[PDB]
Symmetry: C2
Subunit: 101 residues, 2 copies
Amino acid sequence: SEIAVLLRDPTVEEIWIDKSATLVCEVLSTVSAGVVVSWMVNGKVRNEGVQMEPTKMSGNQYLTISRLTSSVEEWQSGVEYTCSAKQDQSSTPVVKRTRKA
Amino acid sequence: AVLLRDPTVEEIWIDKSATLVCEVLVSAGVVVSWMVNGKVRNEGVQMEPTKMSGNQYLTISRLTSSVEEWQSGVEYTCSAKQDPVVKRTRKA
């Protein structure tokens, strides 16, 4: 039942030349159950700028991607970003977090 | 400051490729050297010219590996020598 959650920081390239900051939560599972990803920024619920893609199936695995678009200024304010992924019929959410280096 | 980016699962799934990215943050001169499985790796390496903005210099080097090689679990390292700082990664 356990999902693997990988949280991708915005790249310095994105920050410098795109002038945006996009965080990407990639969720992998060996089970077909649907996945919801909930984001917080600075300890507050964030719905704006969140886009979830429909789950993709490979052979025996399932990939669910959620992206959070943030400003370069928000990323470079040092606030914490959290993604919480939870899969139907699983027991507990899996949480990952990040902030500027 | 050396930031090493793993291939994303989306890249592995959709593009069937695995590209690692080393982003490096005084001098504009920096050379990035890669190792895979403890050996020099030149093949699949592309550096971009150093970028200048404010008091800072940004240099990007990309290593095009393969899905097979990434999934094999071997270690990748990038070493940035400024006018070295090393970062390492491997599949979990």
